[PDB]
């Protein structure tokens, strides 16, 4: 009845990604994308063939989403969740116009962002300060997002994100069933 | 006024449940209802100022020549219009307005205030369901019913003017959707002008 879209969530410091993602995947309406990771020669071949809708190098290995694998899902009306950074977001939005919905999630304050990082004991003060620097770089790209949420309350934020998702499932442009259905109401014999 | 107010436009073929959905959407107070001026004669059960301001054809004409209407249309043989001053006043406070109008008013608002309107078209699941709701509603003479059907068809011809289309299959689900559309648009980036100084605040904050 409708085309699926790629649901793109980004956060400076990307903190609580596993939690917010898990909360949005629980009911099953969103599919997680299975990324190809590092043959190395197939990655370059698929990249040189424009097979990737998104690609990045993380910790010395390549990760990518294949255009074919995403296009299969969206044609069936199933939506896909992406917890990625600005670099991935810009690649998808350029490649999939009309099929992307991007949400940027901001901290209520840097003081609160620092507090959350200082509750991840596996992070030295240096790593904390490096995460703060990357957070400031990411926040500068906020204008590339359809929606921006200030995470003042995680429960409110989950509610808002779910509303964004629900709202986008009934956008006129992606509900291709509307034209024959509405013509059918207009022509129905009474 | 941390973000731009917007005009939340609900349209439906008469008998698809727009009026009931509007009442439920007004309950939590975030939306203010737009009161249209009208040249329709006030019905015995109506009260001026609750849904319409009932004025004369000459007074409607004079308001139109004085540019007082941000939007006006002839709907079912009577004139209806929204005063620009009433919209300006609600939106200056950063507040959102609920609108109960047809496609003619919708198109004017979208052309004058691009980006500040959110339009939702509500459809029946069938015309049989539409007729079933029209009978259950009123004193239900066949003439009024046929004519409401004709109007319903003409309004549905203009569905491409609407940002969202909802098929009213379940009333609770329909309320959930429209409320979800409302909430999503309050956090739409292009109307949150507060963002830039707040994010510059986050980037320039001392750590």
One-character DSSP codes across A152-181:
S-HHHHHHHHHHHHHHHHTBGGG-TTHHHH
- Resolution in angstroms comes to 2.3
Q: Tokens 């691009």 map to which residue?
A: B114
DSSP track, A59-127: TTEEEEEEHHHHHHHHHTT-EEEEE--HHHHHHHHHHSTTSEEEEEEE-S-HHHHHHHHTT-SS--HHH
Q: Which distant-in-sequence residues (6+ apart) come within 8 Å of B143 by Cβ?
A: none
- Residue A129 in 3-state DSSP? helix
Taking contacts as CB-CB distances below 8 angstroms, the residues of chain B near A174 are: none
**Nearest CB to A178; choose among B159, B185, B189:** B159
Residue of chain B with shortest Cα separation from A162: B180
**Does B199 contact A at CB distance below 8 Å?**
yes
Phi/psi of residue B181, nearest 5 degrees: -65, -45
- Indicate left, alpha or beta for A16 from its phi (over 0: left) and psi (-120 to 50: alpha): left
CB < 8 Å & 24+ apart, contacts of A59-67: A61/A37, A62/A36, A62/A37, A62/A38, A63/A35, A63/A36, A63/A37, A63/A38, A64/A35, A64/A36, A65/A33, A65/A35, A65/A36, A66/A36, A67/A95
**Cα angle, residue A62 at apex, residues A58 and A66 outer, rounded to 5°:** 120
Pairing relationship of beta strands B117-123 and B96-100 according to DSSP bridges: unpaired
Tell me: is residue A159 an annotated ligand-binding position: no
Q: In what order do the strands lie in the sheet with A6-10?
A: A30-32, A79-83, A6-10, A100-106, A147-150
Nearest in space to A146 (alpha carbons), one of A5, A3, A1: A5
d(CA A16, CA A126): 20
Q: Which two tokens stand for residue B33?
A: 């209802």
Nearest in space to A161 (alpha carbons), one of A14, A33, A25: A25
Partners of B10 in beta bridges:
B100, B120
- For residue A165, the Cα-to-chain-centroid distance in whole angstroms is 11
Contact B96, B33 (CB under 8 A): no
Distances in Å between the alpha carbon of B167 and those of A3, A170, B26, B99, B123? 17, 9, 21, 19, 5
- For residue A41, the Cα-to-chain-centroid distance in whole angstroms is 27
d(CA A183, CA B66): 40
Q: Which of A118, A185, A187 to mutate to test the interface with B (most CBs of B within 10 A)?
A: A185
Is the Cβ pair B188, A145 closer than 8 Å? no
- Residue B25 in 3-state DSSP? helix
Is the Cβ pair B183, A159 closer than 8 Å? yes
Phi/psi of residue A128, nearest 5 degrees: -60, -45
CB-count burial class (<10 Å; 0-12, 13-18, 19+) for B97:
buried
d(CA B29, CA B22): 12
d(CA A123, CA B17): 55
Q: Which two tokens stand for residue B130?
A: 């539409």
Phi/psi of residue A187, nearest 5 degrees: -95, -5
Residue of chain A with shortest Cα separation from B159: A182
**Nearest CB to B189; choose among A109, A147, A190:** A147
Distance from CA of B191 to the nearest CA of A (A): 10
Q: Which two tokens stand for residue A111?
A: 């003081």
Q: Identify the H or E element spanning A133.
A: helix A125-139
Is the Cβ pair B187, A107 closer than 8 Å? no
Phi/psi of residue B205, nearest 5 degrees: -60, 145
Contact A106, B197 (CB under 8 A): no
d(CA A65, CA B27): 45
Contact B22, B131 (CB under 8 A): no
Pairing relationship of beta strands A52-58 and A61-66 according to DSSP bridges: antiparallel
d(CA A78, CA A31): 7
Taking contacts as CB-CB distances below 8 angstroms, the residues of chain B near A150 are: 198
Experiment type: X-ray
Ranges of each domain in chain B: 1-34+95-207, 35-94
SS (H, E, C) B52-111: EEECCHHHHHHHHHCCCEEEEEEECCEEEEEEHHHHHHHHHCCCEEEEECCHHHHHHHHH
CB within 8 Å of chain A, chain B residues 120-149: 121, 123-124, 126-127, 131, 149
């Amino acid at each position: 009845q409708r085309r699926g879209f790629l649901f793109i969530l980004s956060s400076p410091s990307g903190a609580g990604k596993s939690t917010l993602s898990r909360l949005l995947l629980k009911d099953g309406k969103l599919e997680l994308s299975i990324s190809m990771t590092t043959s190395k020669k197939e990655f370059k071949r698929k990249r040189d063939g424009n097979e990737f809708i998104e690609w990045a190098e993380v910790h010395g290995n390549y990760y990518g989403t294949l255009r074919e694998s995403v296009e299969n899902v969206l044609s069936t009306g199933r939506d896909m969740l992406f917890d990625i950074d600005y670099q991935g977001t810009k690649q998808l939005q350029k490649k999939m116009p009309g099929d992307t919905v991007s949400v940027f999630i901001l901290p209520p304050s840097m003081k609160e962002l620092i507090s959350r990082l200082y509750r991840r004991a596996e992070d030295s003060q240096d790593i904390i300060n490096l995460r703060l620097k990357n957070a400031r770089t990411e926040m500068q790209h906020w204008r590339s997002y359809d929606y921006v949420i200030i995470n003042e309350n995680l429960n409110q934020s989950v509610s808002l994100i779910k509303s964004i998702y629900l709202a986008e499932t009934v956008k006129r442009e992606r509900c291709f069933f509307l034209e024959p259905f509405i013509n059918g109401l207009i022509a129905e014999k009474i």
